Amino acid sequence: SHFNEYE
Amino acid sequence: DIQMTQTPSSLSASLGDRVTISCRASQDISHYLNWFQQKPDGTVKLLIYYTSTLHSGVPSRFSGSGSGTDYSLTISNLEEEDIAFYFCQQGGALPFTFGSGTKLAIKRADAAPTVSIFPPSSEQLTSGGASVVCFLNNFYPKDINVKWKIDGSERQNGVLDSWTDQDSKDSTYSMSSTLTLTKDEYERHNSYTCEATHKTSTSPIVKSFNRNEC
Amino acid sequence: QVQLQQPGAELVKPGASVKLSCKASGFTFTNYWMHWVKQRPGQGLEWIGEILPSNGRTNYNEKFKTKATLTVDKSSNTAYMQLSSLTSEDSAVYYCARSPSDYWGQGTTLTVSSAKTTAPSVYPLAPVCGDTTGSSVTLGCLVKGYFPEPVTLTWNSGSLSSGVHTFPAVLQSDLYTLSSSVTVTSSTWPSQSITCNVAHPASSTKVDKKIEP
Ligand SMILES: [Cl-]
Ligand code: NI
């Protein structure tokens, strides 16, 4: 849900 | 900072209705738009992430759409459990930021407030204090204005007001207004008036009493 | 079972510091970002920042850089946020949360005040004398000058619910005040006894006030 984590 | 502008700030609808809420970002957020739902007990849940992906267990009546800078959350057929506070969050760039929120409410038929005024108790008076309280109960819609008068003169200092959230069962709102004075000032005047102005009537609902008269 | 456990409330003095805790369970938080968010009554939610437990990296909202310090205790799977130099502007509900597969704690209500524990004065509110002609009558109860929250208010020991409105407390001075109204058919009162029951746990008080004509 955020650009800096894997979703 | 990517600033989020959310609209509308409040929305009253009928159960079964389609409702749509928007969030506009300041600059491109590359689809990282999340929608959160908060209940009156403080509970917060993620509903949709990355613009349109439903989170675990979220019912299919919820959908999200948008791109670049313009995003929307749509509830197909509003259910009672959907009455809550909704807010967006951009996760496209640091720092993360939120929209200012949309409070949903159930629309109901208009209702005039029931107004009651209460003189200070003898127990308060014995302590040197004098609070006059006015209850404005079970009205709709939510906006209302209360004016206090002492011997026919408008009074603003010393007034505290409180408002309930929308009632769970009947969809009305209620409000309490308290004028707190010293006993000394209370005993110098005779007439105390609470006046309520609401959409249901062009003339104020006026309640009052005289300190001598019992 | 994917829970974030936070304490319900904290009370601290201005100038002091506080350490909010967020205990994770049902998952190991190592590779989840742990965020902190501030919510106040008429303001939009604010993001404070986030910490990644695996390597301790933090990303802060610069507005909170000198106010908040995020840390983690990996051995208890707990995230913390220390707030310093507290002012009344720091009074708010603070949430922790994880991401991705987001899940939020229930929030900690932080109150920053110098007020001392104080028991409420409870006063019965009877209708204006003269004669009320309605089929119903409204009575009330005014609870003034207490600290901290909360107070529990019931009518006839909880047997009278229905027709009851209890308003949210508001902060007159450094103390709280609330009120409650009860509406009953006119034939029930004053022939049947109606009393307001107020408890304030922090000052261990319990008071009953009968509404008398
Ligand atoms: Cl990062
Ligand atoms: Ni005067």
Side-chain angles (χ1 to χ4, degrees), chain B residues 46-57:
Chain B
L46 168 66
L47 294 184
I48 294 167
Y49 63 99
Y50 202 60
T51 303
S52 65
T53 310
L54 274 55
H55 187 38
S56 288

Side-chain angles (χ1 to χ4, degrees), chain C residues 18-97:
Chain C
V18 67
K19 199 157 169 182
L20 301 182
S21 66
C22 175
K23 193 172 172 66
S25 69
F27 72 118
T28 309
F29 75 174
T30 303
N31 306 308
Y32 286 90
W33 283 100
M34 291 313 294
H35 299 243
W36 291 83
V37 343
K38 177 182 181 171
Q39 179 169 36
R40 290 195 275 194
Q43 336 315 291
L45 290 155
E46 300 184 75
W47 185 79
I48 296 167
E50 65 178 357
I51 180 166
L52 179 65
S54 66
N55 67 357
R57 286 186 53 249
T58 52
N59 293 304
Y60 291 90
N61 165 0
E62 287 224 300
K63 169 150 109 103
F64 291 93
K65 255 162 199 65
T66 68
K67 174 65 60 169
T69 302
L70 271 28
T71 54
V72 106
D73 175 347
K74 281 179 269 92
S75 67
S76 59
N77 253 237
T78 306
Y80 298 101
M81 175 172 64
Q82 185 175 294
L83 262 10
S84 61
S85 299
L86 303 161
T87 79
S88 74
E89 280 280 294
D90 293 318
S91 284
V93 178
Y94 293 87
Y95 290 91
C96 67

